[PDB]
């Protein structure tokens, strides 16, 4: 299941289970736009910033 959903605290959960990355469970900055990459790299953009 690739339907990944963000939380208000910013952690990545799939069906309520936090997603596991290379640093353990993945925590993403709150209120950011995410672009998963062909190798799973997660890029975070803060709205308003260039």
């Amino acid at each position: 299941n690739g339907n990944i959903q963000v939380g208000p605290t910013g952690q990545l959960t799939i069906q309520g289970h936090p997603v596991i990355g290379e640093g353990g469970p993945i925590t993403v900055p709150e209120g950011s736009e995410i672009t998963i990459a062909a190798d799973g790299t997660i890029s975070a953009l803060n709205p308003g910033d260039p």
């Binding site: 990459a37 062909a38 190798d39 790299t41 890029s43």
Partner: peptide, 16 residues
């Protein structure tokens, strides 16, 4: 419409 943010990491060493 944004959809796929350009300049994102396409892969660990490459970008879109």
């Amino acid at each position: 419409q944004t959809i796929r943010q350009p300049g994102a990491q396409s892969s660990e060493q490459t970008t879109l």
